[PDB]
């Protein structure tokens, strides 16, 4: 059976991919995404990231690049091959690879 993508991001980044068809509830009524309001504590974001990477249905996590810098500890602690993580740029946010975990794993990176 197919896996599903999951998203951590602001209202626009979540809304964009939801219209891109990404959104699914697990049968337990839990979503595959988190809307990061400015009031959300970094620990709640990290708990979500931990839940998503440890879940069996999720196959990719998209993290908006600014969130990836906040949750950076757990994001760099995550090292499994299957549950892939993409740090992604957005309209008011840093460039497409700002301290990217994969480019920091790489030996040939400048």
């Amino acid at each position: 059976r197919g896996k599903l993508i999951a998203v951590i991001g602001d209202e626009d980044t979540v809304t964009g991919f939801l219209l891109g068809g990404i959104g699914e509830l697990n049968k337990n009524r839990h979503p595959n995404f988190l809307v990061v309001e400015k009031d959300t504590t970094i620990n709640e974001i990290e708990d979500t990231f931990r839940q998503f990477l440890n879940r069996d249905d999720i196959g990719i996590i998209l993290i908006n690049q600014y969130i990836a810098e906040m949750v950076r500890h757990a994001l760099d602690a995550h090292q499994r091959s299957i549950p892939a993580v993409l740090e992604i740029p957005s309209k008011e946010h840093p460039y497409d690879a700002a301290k990217d975990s994969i480019l920091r794993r790489a030996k040939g990176m400048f």
Binding site: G2, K3, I5, G16, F17, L18, L19, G20, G21, I22, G23, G59, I60, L62, Q79, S81, I82, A84, V85, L86, I88, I102, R105, A106
Partner: protein, 99 residues
């Protein structure tokens, strides 16, 4: 399965049913139709990017495992053999001088 190593990747697949089909029916449905296509195109690229990442992490492990075997041969197995053979050639000369 190139060079005997299993590399995981993803294929993008589509369920047909649009859960947002009627959104903006009254207003904005023109731009929202462009938008759902643009983020579907973003996802299709991101699933390819994730397939590069799943391949990358698996290659990085398979290179390390292979290089540990190559270095174990180069710095353990071959040196034990070469020192064993040098000891053998020496003791064979000892048997020859004794005889």
């Amino acid at each position: 399965n190139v060079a005997g190593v299993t590399l995981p990747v993803f294929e993008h697949y589509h369920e047909g049913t649009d859960s947002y089909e009627l959104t903006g029916l009254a207003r904005g449905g023109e731009q929202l139709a462009k938008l759902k296509r643009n983020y579907a195109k973003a996802v299709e690229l991101l699933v390819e990017l994730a397939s590069l990442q799943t391949s990358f992490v698996t290659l990085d492990e398979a290179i390390k495992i292979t290089n540990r075997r190559v270095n174990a041969i180069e710095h353990v197995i071959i040196p034990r053999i070469e020192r064993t053979l040098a000891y053998i050639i020496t003791e064979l000369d000892e048997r020859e001088r004794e005889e």
